[PDB]
From a paper:
The pneumococcal serine-rich repeat protein (PsrP) is an important lung-specific virulence factor that is present in 60% of strains capable of causing pneumonia in children. Pneumococcal PsrP promotes both biofilm formation through self-oligomerization and adherence to keratin 10 (KRT10)-expressing lung epithelial cells. In this study, the crystal structure of the KRT10-binding region of PsrP (BR187–385) was determined, revealing a novel fold distantly related to CnaA subdomains. While one face of the compressed, two-sided barrel of BR187–385 is created by an extended β-sheet that presents a highly basic binding groove, extensive well-ordered loop regions distort the other face of the barrel, forming a paperclip-like substructure.
BR187–385 crystallized in two crystal forms of the space groups P43212 and P4122, with differing unit cell parameters. Single anomalous dispersion (SAD) data, collected from a seleno-methionine derivative of the P43212 crystal form that diffracted to 2.25 Å, was used to solve the phase problem. Three BR187–385 polypeptide chains were placed in the asymmetric unit, and refined to R- and Rfree-values of 18.6% and 21.5%, respectively. The structural deviation between the P4122-BR187–385 monomer and each of the three P43212-BR187–385 molecules was minimal, with root mean square deviations (r.m.s.d.) of 0.6 Å and less than 0.4 Å, following superposition of the P4122 monomer on the P43212 chains A and B/C, respectively. Crystal packing analysis revealed that two symmetry-related molecules in the P4122 crystal formed an intermolecular β-sheet resulting in an interface area of 585 Å2. The same interface was also observed for chains B and C in the P43212 crystal form. We believe, at the present stage, that the formed pseudo-complexes are probably owing to crystal packing. In conclusion, the crystal structure of the BR187–385 monomer takes a compressed barrel fold with one face formed by an extended and twisted β-sheet, and the other face mainly consisting of well-ordered loops.
Residue numbers in the entry: 204 to 377
């Protein structure tokens, strides 16, 4: 008898340049041995599956989905171990991988973790309904599997303007 539990979190912010919604999705699966995290930033509204406005973003515009050490992405409860590397890739509308980027190194900053700059997405993809996706695992060693995740998106120049604020924290207790 294998058992697992999955939560999907979604939220929304504002791209300052194009004045459009920008969205994130975070899927977290707990199978008893580890938490698997999948984090996607996209212009496709997860509620409707409709792509945002309006064709008028240039192809070489580009965004990151992780801050560097401008901000902590992830904090972990007492019975979660060290996160793996963070795989980075572009996903299509159905979440299947289109191409892959360098795997990032998860490091500690502050009370939690970040990974640093690695992948980006450019209008040439955002406009196809694609997302910029990162995934990693964290071992479970006991009962306190709480965590918080803070989403991030910014154009590759000007790393300081997080499109999500970033006051849109995901907080899971235990």
């Amino acid at each position: 008898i294998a058992k697992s539990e999955t939560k999907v979190y979604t939220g929304e912010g504002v791209d300052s340049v194009y004045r459009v919604p920008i969205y994130y999705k975070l899927k977290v699966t707990n199978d008893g041995s580890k938490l698997t995290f999948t984090y996607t930033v996209t212009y496709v509204n997860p509620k409707t599956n409709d792509l945002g406005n309006i064709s008028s973003m240039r192809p070489g515009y580009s965004i990151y989905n992780s801050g560097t050490s401008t901000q902590t992405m992830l904090t972990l409860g007492s019975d979660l171990g060290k996160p793996s590397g963070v795989k980075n890739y572009i996903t299509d509308k159905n979440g299947r991988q289109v191409l892959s980027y360098n795997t990032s190194t998860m490091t500690t900053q502050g009370s939690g973790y970040t990974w640093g700059n690695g992948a980006q997405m450019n209008g040439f993809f955002a406009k196809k309904g694609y997302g910029l996706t990162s995934s990693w695992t964290v071992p479970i060693t006991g009962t306190d599997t709480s965590f918080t995740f803070t989403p991030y998106a910014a154009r590759t120049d000007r790393i300081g303007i997080n499109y999500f604020n970033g006051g849109g924290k995901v907080v899971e207790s235990s």
